[PDB]
Amino acid sequence: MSNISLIVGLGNPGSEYAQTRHNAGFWFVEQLADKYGITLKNDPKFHGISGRGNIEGHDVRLLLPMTYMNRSGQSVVPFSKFYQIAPEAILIAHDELDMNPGVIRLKTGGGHGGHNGLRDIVPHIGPNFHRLRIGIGHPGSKERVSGHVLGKAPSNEQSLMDGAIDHALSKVKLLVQGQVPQAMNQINAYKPA
Numbered sequence: 001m002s003n004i005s006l007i008v009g010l011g012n013p014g015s016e017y018a019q020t021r022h023n024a025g026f027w028f029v030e031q032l033a034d035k036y037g038i039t040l041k042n043d044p045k046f047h048g049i050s051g052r053g054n055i056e057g058h059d060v061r062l063l064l065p066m067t068y069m070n071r072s073g074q075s076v077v078p079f080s081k082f083y084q085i086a087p088e089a090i091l092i093a094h095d096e097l098d099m100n101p102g103v104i105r106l107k108t109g110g111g112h113g114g115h116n117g118l119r120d121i122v123p124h125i126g127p128n129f130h131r132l133r134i135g136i137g138h139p140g141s142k143e144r145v146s147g148h149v150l151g152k153a154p155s156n157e158q159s160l161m162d163g164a165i166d167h168a169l170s171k172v173k174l175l176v177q178g179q180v181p182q183a184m185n186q187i188n189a190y191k192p193a
């Protein structure tokens with residue numbers, strides 16, 4: 001059903017990308033894995049790093065594609081199909097250009113919103129997965145997007161994102177329990193200050 005049992009974090013592999021805004025999804029899933037003691041180990045079969053563990057009495061899988069962002073579907077799609085995880089049980093955490101640092105929202109359905117990771121996923125499994133939209137801000141102009149998402153945020157913006165991510169971690173219990181409406185209410189209500 002809508003008991004979240006796959007949590008995907010989008011991002012790029014390599015130390016040079018680890019601190020960039022486009023890896024917001026990785027930050028969330030890495031922190032979630034540490035919170036619940038889920039081992040994120042090499043998963044060559046699905047071109048990623050993945051884990052499996054107990055979150056609040058539920059068997060949950062975690063996935064970080066190691067395909068580079070624009071090829072994220074080349075991990076997520078075969079992984080979800082192999083383990084027979086329907087989109088309705090998937091949460092994908094990703095950076096959101098259309099939201100401020102420190103703003104975070106749970107969304108069900110919808111398009112990719114210009115996001116090149118999601119762009120590679122929705123064509124295959126459809127739109128009906130859940131998304132943890134982690135606000136990163138927009139660089140104003142259209143052609144400066146690459147420089148923004150592949151940039152390391154200033155400390156204040158990082159602090160704002162980190163606080164929002166921490167808040168979201170506290171609400172994963174609701175999501176794995178299938179309380180998507182309550183999780184949406186409580187996640188979306190987050191304020192940094």
Ligand SMILES: O=c1ccn([C@@H]2O[C@H](CO)[C@@H](O)[C@H]2O)c(=O)[nH]1
Nearest residue numbers: 012022068069070071116117146
């Ligand atoms: O060295 C790089 C840098 C970025 N990109 C791709 O360009 C996307 C913008 O989403 C990237 O994040 C990633 O898929 C690469 O393929 N290689």
